[PDB]
Write a protein that binds this ligand. Sequence first.
Ligand SMILES: *c1c(C)c(C)cc2c1nc1c(=O)[nH]c(=O)nc-1n2C[C@H](O)[C@H](O)[C@H](O)COP(=O)(O)O
Ligand SMILES: *c1c(C)c(C)cc2c1nc1c(=O)[nH]c(=O)nc-1n2C[C@H](O)[C@H](O)[C@H](O)COP(=O)(O)O
Ligand SMILES: Nc1ncnc2c1ncn2[C@@H]1O[C@H](COP(=O)(O)OP(=O)(O)O)[C@@H](O)[C@H]1O
Ligand SMILES: Nc1ncnc2c1ncn2[C@@H]1O[C@H](COP(=O)(O)OP(=O)(O)O)[C@@H](O)[C@H]1O
Ligand code: SF4
Ligand code: SF4
Lengths: 729, 729
Amino acid sequence: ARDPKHDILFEPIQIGPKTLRNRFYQVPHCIGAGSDKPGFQSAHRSVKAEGGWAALNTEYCSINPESDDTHRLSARIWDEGDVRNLKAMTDEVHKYGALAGVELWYGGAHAPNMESRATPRGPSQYASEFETLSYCKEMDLSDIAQVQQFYVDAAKRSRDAGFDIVYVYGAHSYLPLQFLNPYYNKRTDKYGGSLENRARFWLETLEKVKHAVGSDCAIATRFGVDTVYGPGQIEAEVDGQKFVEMADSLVDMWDITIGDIAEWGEDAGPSRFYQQGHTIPWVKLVKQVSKKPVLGVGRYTDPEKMIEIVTKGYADIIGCARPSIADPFLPQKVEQGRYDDIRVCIGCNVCISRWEIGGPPMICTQNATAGEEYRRGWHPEKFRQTKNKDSVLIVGAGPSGSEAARVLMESGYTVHLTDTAEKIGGHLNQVAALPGLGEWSYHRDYRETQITKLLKKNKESQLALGQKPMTADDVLQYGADKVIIATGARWNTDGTNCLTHDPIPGADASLPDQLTPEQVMDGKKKIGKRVVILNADTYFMAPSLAEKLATAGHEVTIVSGVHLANYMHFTLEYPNMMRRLHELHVEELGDHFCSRIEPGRMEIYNIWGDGSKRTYRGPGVSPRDANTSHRWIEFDSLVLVTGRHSECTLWNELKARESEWAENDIKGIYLIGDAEAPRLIADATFTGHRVAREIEEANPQIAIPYKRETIAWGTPHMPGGNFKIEYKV
Amino acid sequence: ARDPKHDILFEPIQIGPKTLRNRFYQVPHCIGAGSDKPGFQSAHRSVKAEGGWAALNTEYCSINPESDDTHRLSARIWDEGDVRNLKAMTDEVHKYGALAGVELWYGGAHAPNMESRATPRGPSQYASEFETLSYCKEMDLSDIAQVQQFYVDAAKRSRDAGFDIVYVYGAHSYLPLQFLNPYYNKRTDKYGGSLENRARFWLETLEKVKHAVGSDCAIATRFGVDTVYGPGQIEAEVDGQKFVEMADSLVDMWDITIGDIAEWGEDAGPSRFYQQGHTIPWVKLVKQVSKKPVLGVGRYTDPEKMIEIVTKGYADIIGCARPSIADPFLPQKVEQGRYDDIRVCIGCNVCISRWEIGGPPMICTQNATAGEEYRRGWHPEKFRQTKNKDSVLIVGAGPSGSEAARVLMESGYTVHLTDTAEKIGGHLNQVAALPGLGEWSYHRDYRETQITKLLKKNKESQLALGQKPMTADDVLQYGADKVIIATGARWNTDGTNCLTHDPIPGADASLPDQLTPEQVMDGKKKIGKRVVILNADTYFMAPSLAEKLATAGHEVTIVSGVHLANYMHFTLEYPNMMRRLHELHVEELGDHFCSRIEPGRMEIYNIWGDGSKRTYRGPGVSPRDANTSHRWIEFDSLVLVTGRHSECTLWNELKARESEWAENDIKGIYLIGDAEAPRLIADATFTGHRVAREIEEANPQIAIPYKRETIAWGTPHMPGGNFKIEYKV
Ligand SMILES: *c1c(C)c(C)cc2c1nc1c(=O)[nH]c(=O)nc-1n2C[C@H](O)[C@H](O)[C@H](O)COP(=O)(O)O
Ligand SMILES: *c1c(C)c(C)cc2c1nc1c(=O)[nH]c(=O)nc-1n2C[C@H](O)[C@H](O)[C@H](O)COP(=O)(O)O
Ligand SMILES: Nc1ncnc2c1ncn2[C@@H]1O[C@H](COP(=O)(O)OP(=O)(O)O)[C@@H](O)[C@H]1O
Ligand SMILES: Nc1ncnc2c1ncn2[C@@H]1O[C@H](COP(=O)(O)OP(=O)(O)O)[C@@H](O)[C@H]1O
Ligand code: SF4
Ligand code: SF4
């Protein structure tokens, strides 16, 4: 049953001329879709429609080629081709009976424009503190009118397109905010200086937009009421409130955030430094001056926390991004009181990783159909159920094999899931024990919860933890019709890395002063005063261990032969990770690899130590001047973080005797998770999702094709244009 | 007319079943188009077809979703949608009586596969030394059969798609090379170890591909004969020749490069460390051993150097890429001995900078239409002539106005080009005067050369150099019909950067210990022993200056508040620019910005000094713990590299008086190049390309729409496929 305290959550609300069925709102967020992947765009929001979110929005949407985000992908609404492709989504959000917003964006010099080549305009000439090579032109007054018309234009085309909501997107430090904020705005004419100068641009723009589609579409704005930068940018209690005050008659809805563009990690809080509701203290302050509907994200996945912020008159509605990617159905689950079925977004930000890399599609570590709803046509809550009696053994119940079973059992199969560990989760279990990552548990937590639930519903199906590792004999004699090995990967023992692809001589972590991140993480093996983490890994492992050990008070140097924490730049984690390693006085030696380990001693080298000029030096002979900077650093205990390898020992074995599966009634064995290859957690979890959804194809071991959304020669993006080559002569 | 030494160059050559008209052929290279931009692909290759090149290739072309390079773009030949889409270009190469090649690609784990999410295979389990989180699974021997299949399936569809040439791509360290090359191959079986095993993989592959389309299609290999690593990886005189030996019977033509993946710069040599023919030593060794046609890139632009390398039997053919982007017509310009009309690629590698960021189109610093041949139908050698007697004043003869001149005059306009510099070229004049960048002059060299010849043909046109800078009133009373201001930008003088967008306290390069990048390059200002360069810019200025000063024997520390030479990463400049800064004992202080300059001394700070824990702290205070890292360093002379700004003074003047333009018979004034806003040279040059082409539209100052290559809803990529959502249930 729905706990009736949550009723509050299903009460409509008025937003201008528009009505939100309920409180659950998907704010604008990218997905790797834009106007360019109209399949993928429609499907992924429409399931959240069907899932019962109230309003769904496109990601930030460009009003004009002089705000082009390439290499990133944004959405666009430049022409009637765009109004085509975005309408696919509106119709589709419509048929389920919520609303379609579209987020009107121009971002000035934050748009590098690498496709459109055009020149970006701003309040003042600057160069982006994010695309640092990309400068704007200073708008004169005629530039102020032409760009504003831009939005108008774009607001019209938004209505043709079928949007029920339009925004003047003023967050993450894009145009309207750049005017407002003195950081950017060095104008001394009437658009600058006085608080009502600064906000004229936006104030104007808002009005123009209202005038434009005001009577058919609610105009909302998003606004970044505090920059969390302090004095010198927007402060909520300085410019923030006041601005709210000056706008309020224009807005149908506020949509609130804090942060800029360069470290929007602060909006999209890592669970590694932010909890739920993080934003609230600055969220709150907006109701205390607005007389209008106010929502404001903050990784709100808990309906308890949801009701708090409404019954305490801190928001009116619930703004979500990530959590809607995790679980497009999270509302109808809350409406249906199905509390345990809710897939909790972990704050891992892989989802922001893809978009932030420039091009690839979003993927997600809980929701493996995210990105997969058009092109693979996987629905997150409906599954093809089997038309046989077939059964599956799954070895190992980590991300990979646990999704494996989740999906299969949801598919109706008969499954036996076994692992040698005592609990569901494979290596997530240590991972979540690293400082900060405690909310990454959630990913086995949800699995443990559903397999348990799935077992009462399949009667043959079986969970078995605490088992004796399986052998290939147990396996061939097991009686599953099919077998999924999902046995994992371990840190490399031997200094094997991405640079050399061979072992570091004198690396081996059976020796007393030499650790893996398993041994550091198990907590048994003893750890010397002086530590050196030898790092070949660009993702979280290294920094994190660093944090751990430092906080346990060792003296810490990371030797890095790769750019440390590079991945993290992309999950929005990097700022606060660095500041953090600073704070704990963690020493970083970059651009530095290692050539032999000895007790208490390792030989390290700068990777740009070779010679700058390349000569044909004949065979047997380096064609640079050789690298002469190697030097010997000591350590109590060395922690290798060099690479990882697949544990495919059993699968080696099962493969070797693949000749006996046929007598054993085994129709196939498939490899998945880290055991095929070391992958993201997300990607681990997909490979399970896949073999499952695909257990019935010829070779499940390999994916079947998926829709591709790429252009067909002889078809005009533009309606009724010439596809043909056409030179201007 | 054609110096007859050069006829050699137009002598046809046999390649298996296929005939090359002449010895000018464009090897495989990326443009940012692949399968996804078939207008673009077709056109950009067709005009090189029209221009006389004999065989044109697609860029690296994917055989299968488990080699996807997203977020990079490569081509695809995965199904019918692809065959259609690649067809357009083969049809279009064909109409000019040239060949169409397609380079068949598998990458193994250098394919991050972020679109497809699939798992890539190799000879051995590794993690790419490039895409460091992306690992492959190790082929069993069925794996070995499956992958080769792929090549075959792909090579048939190659044929359906209308290609004349099919490669087995083995360069830059992709799959084939990954077997052959022990750095990757750790197999102990019949695929591994001996030389005969290591080539097995390629060897079979080539076979089956020949068996597959051998009859209709030239089978090419591209092969990396030395990795330019030394022993341990491939050496020419070790396995290189020996490999060529083994293969020689299958291969209709060698295509030789040197280098790996993670630093392929060495193949695509920067003119800042490679001169023309740089590859030869290792290129020539191939002939020694081969009985087949051999070509081998080395940025050949010079027909002399061209005919050196054939007569010396070092090559049989001429392979370019870059020069082919530079001048699609280069050969019909050799052929027509119109040597002064050939646009020499300067080896700035900006072209490879877009592909390498991953997603954007290529663009080029000498050729403004590259990329621009489909979606804006600009042809590199054909201009829409003017239908009036209008005249243009252009103020400033730099990349941007000089390109503006060159195109306008080519379009029949009467132009008068004024610049207070002595020589055509604006800032590139200094910039070519940096260590290594001597080959960048070519980019003015070529326009001085065409404006001088255009004058002769357009008799009232005029060039005037060494003039008094124009004033607002000169311009008004100048009588041009329209005016182009192309006045430039300058390094910023007061410590204005992209991190505060404010000037630093105590920077001013009127003081005798503080210099700008112009002052430095001029060689006038005296510079003291110890130097700090305070860098905000992520391109070549800083490092270059460092290079020069150091080699002037000052003592050198780079302070950088951004990541130094980030761009150069993407030009493939970075490694050798590092080892160079290394060899010259140049000091690097990164993640360090500055808050105060005094005479002899500056106050710098760690950008990760602030605290990690963000609390709401009320207005007017920092919400992190404040930064306590500030500390003073000394210098004799300080070099500001902190940003740049637009010289827009004249323009702010002419527009204040826009009122009096009509009185003065001025229909408009348009602003371009750095003066509108600070941009690469490429871009600055494009801006001038653009206002020319478009001198006759509404508002020149703003570009017209170009065709876009995005999918239109309801049209399937797949022939006869379903565009509509369809979930699997
Ligand atoms: C892209 C990505 C995937 C993420 C997850 C967020 C995001 C993305 N693109 C956005 C954009 O187009 N415009 C915009 O205004 N916001 C965009 N977002 C951020 C999102 O809307 C939220 O503000 C944050 O994720 C924080 O809230 P929450 O997800 O914790 O609920
Ligand atoms: C892309 C870019 C634009 C550059 C010019 C080189 C290049 C690019 N993409 C390639 C890819 O598709 N596969 C491949 O094997 N090589 C690729 N290259 C290299 C190009 O083929 C040449 O090997 C070098 O550029 C040097 O040639 P040159 O331009 O000096 O004549
Ligand atoms: N012999 C096997 N039998 C049962 N479990 C195994 C066996 N080999 C490895 N495991 C288990 O496999 C799981 C592998 O998990 P993990 O690293 O998280 O891989 P993945 O991330 O892809 O799921 C672990 O819990 C480990 O206990
Ligand atoms: N006021 C002026 N009158 C004449 N020439 C000018 C004037 N102001 C600047 N210039 C010229 O403008 C050119 C600007 O060119 P440059 O900085 O190279 O711009 P870009 O990179 O856009 O080509 C410089 O060569 C300088 O000659
Ligand atoms: S990738 Fe992680 S943070 Fe993002 S929506 Fe998914 S579970 Fe949430
Ligand atoms: S960008 Fe530079 S290296 Fe490239 S084709 Fe153009 S001139 Fe050549």
